[PDB]
Design a protein around this ligand. Sequence first.
Ligand SMILES: *[C@@H]1O[C@H](CO)[C@@H](O)[C@H](O)[C@H]1NC(C)=O
Ligand SMILES: *[C@@H]1O[C@H](CO)[C@@H](O)[C@H](O)[C@H]1NC(C)=O
Ligand SMILES: *[C@@H]1O[C@H](CO)[C@@H](O)[C@H](O)[C@H]1NC(C)=O
Length: 606
Amino acid sequence: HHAADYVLYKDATKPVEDRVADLLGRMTLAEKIGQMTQIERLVATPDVLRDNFIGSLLSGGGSVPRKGATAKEWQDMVDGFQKACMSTRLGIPMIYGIDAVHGQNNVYGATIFPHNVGLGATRDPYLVKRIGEATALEVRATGIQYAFAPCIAVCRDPRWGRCYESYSEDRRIVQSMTELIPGLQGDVPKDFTSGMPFVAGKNKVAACAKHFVGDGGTVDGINENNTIINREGLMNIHMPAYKNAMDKGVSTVMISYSSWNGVKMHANQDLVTGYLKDTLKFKGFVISDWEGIDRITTPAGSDYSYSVKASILAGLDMIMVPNKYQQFISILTGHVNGGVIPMSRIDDAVTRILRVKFTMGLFENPYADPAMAEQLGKQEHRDLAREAARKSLVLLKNGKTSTDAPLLPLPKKAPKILVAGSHADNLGYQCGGWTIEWQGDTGRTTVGTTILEAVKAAVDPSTVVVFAENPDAEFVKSGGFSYAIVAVGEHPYTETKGDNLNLTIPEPGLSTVQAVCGGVRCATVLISGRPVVVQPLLAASDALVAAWLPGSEGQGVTDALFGDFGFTGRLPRTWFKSVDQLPMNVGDAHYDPLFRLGYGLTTNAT
Ligand SMILES: *[C@@H]1O[C@H](CO)[C@@H](O)[C@H](O)[C@H]1NC(C)=O
Ligand SMILES: *[C@@H]1O[C@H](CO)[C@@H](O)[C@H](O)[C@H]1NC(C)=O
Ligand SMILES: *[C@@H]1O[C@H](CO)[C@@H](O)[C@H](O)[C@H]1NC(C)=O
C-alpha cells in the first residue's frame, strides 16, 4: 500500500489483527520475549531498553523522577524511554504503567479522589465513570498510557490491608463500579465483542481489572494468602465483576498474589487460560503483579526458573519483573530453546500485548502531548473529587438521645469554633495509602485542602476558628466554643502493612475525641479505610461521620457538615460489633452487625 519500503504493521489504515499478524511474523525470539518483559524505571536506560527489546515500563509506588516533579518532567522521562524503544529495529513503542488508583496518585499536584470504599458508599456508578474520565486525563498529563485500575476485589474481611481498595463486600456494588473502565478507556462501540480490549485514543488510557481472582476472600484477611471457597462461591462472589469488565472492553487483567484452595493464581492454568481466556474470551493481555511469579514458591524467589515456567504456562502474557530483567529474559529464552515452553505460548502472549498497543493507538501516538500537562490537578477535577468525597460520607450518629437537637448541619456563623484531632490538618492522613509514596505519608505531601482549611473557607467571616491538635478537656471547657469538629482515625497504609487483627485506631484519637466532646458538643469525623472499633468513639460524640479516605478535597467534608448538601452516603460494608465476629457477612448464621450493610442517616441541605 505504496512506498517502496511499505511495511503493513506501520500502516495506521489497516485493521488491528492484520497489523498484529504482520508484526508478529517479523519478530525474533529476543524481540518477542522483550515484549513480555515489564521493567521498573529505576533499572531502565536507553541501552537496556533497546538491547533487550523491552515491551513495558512501570513506576512502582513512590517511583518518581524527583520529588515535586512537574507534569512536563514526567512527560520528558516517559518520552526519553520511548525514544529508546522507537529506535529498535522494529520500533515497537513501550507502554508505561502506573498505580493511578484514586487519581494519578504518585504525582505531586494530581487530584486525589476518595479511595474505592468511599466510592462504594456513594452508590453512584456515573460519578465513578466521571472519576475514570478525569483520571485518564491526569495520567496522560504525565505522558503515561496505562493505569493499574480498577481493583474489583470484593473484600470479605476488613482486617485485609487492601480493604479500602475494594468498592464493597457486595459484589453487585463492585459490578456497578466497573463503570470506571469506560471512564478510563472510553465507551466501547455499539456492536463491540465482550472480551476484546479497547482504548479510544490518546486522551484515554489502558485499564486493568485486578487482582484475578479472589484477592478479597483470603483467610483472616491476610494479604496475598489463601482464598478457601468452593467454585460456586468463587463464581458467585469473586468472579462476576470480571465478566462486566469483559463486556466493557478492559484492556488488561492483573493476576493476584493470592491462592485459590492452595493453588497460586500466578500458576493457575485452569483459571487464567481455561476460564479467563478460553471461557470469558478475554483477548487483551494478562500481567503479573510485582514479583508475583517469584512468590509462587516458598520461600519467594527460591526457584526463579520454575516461577518463569509455571507463570508463562499458566497463561500470563507480560511479567512485572520488575528489576531482574536480564535473568527473566535469559531463563525464558532457555525454556523456549529447550522445548519446555512452546512457541505457540510465546506467540499468544505477544499477540495479546501487540493487540492492546495497536488498538489504543500507541504506534500512532507513542510520545506525550505537551498540551495535556495542564490537565494535572485541574480545578474541574478537584470539583469532581469534592463531589465524590461529600457523597461518600456516611452519617452514623446525629444526636446522643432521641430527644436531642440534631447537631448537623452546623451553622456557618458562630462566635468561636474548635477544629481538633490528628486528622484535622493532615493532608497525607486524609488521602491514605497510594498517595505520593507507596504507603502514603504524613503532612502536606501534595496540593489539597485539609479539613481545617476547608472549615476556614466555609465559615462566616465573623466566625473565629481555633485549631488544637490534641487539646485537653480544660482547654475545651474554657474556650467559649459553640461546637467542635474533631477528626481522627487510621494512619496511611498499603498492602501487607495494613493487615490488622485489632482494628483499633492509633492514639491519641479516642482520647482527643473524649476530651473535646466532654467540653463542647462535637462532630467527630472518622478517617479510615474500613470499619474500625467505633463504640467508644460513638459514646463520646454528638454526631459521627465515617469519611473513609476522602482524598485531597477536604471541602467535600465541610460541604455536608455545614449543610450545603445533605448526607446521602450508605455503608458499602458491614460494620462489626467486635473483631472476634470476623469474618461476618450477610447470610452468615452469626450476622449481628453494629450497623448493617446499607445503613446511613440523612440530613437536608440548609
Ligand atoms: C499464608 O500466611 C502464612 C503465614 O504467614 C504463610 O506461611 C503461608 O505461606 C501463606 N499462604 C499463602 C497461600 O500465601
Ligand atoms: C493493631 O494492629 C496493628 C497492625 O498490625 C498494630 O500496628 C497495632 O499496634 C495494633 N494495635 C493494638 C494491638 O492495640
Ligand atoms: C428531609 O426532608 C424530607 C421532606 O422532603 C423529610 O421527610 C425528612 O424527614 C427530612 N429530614 C431528614 C433528617 O430526613
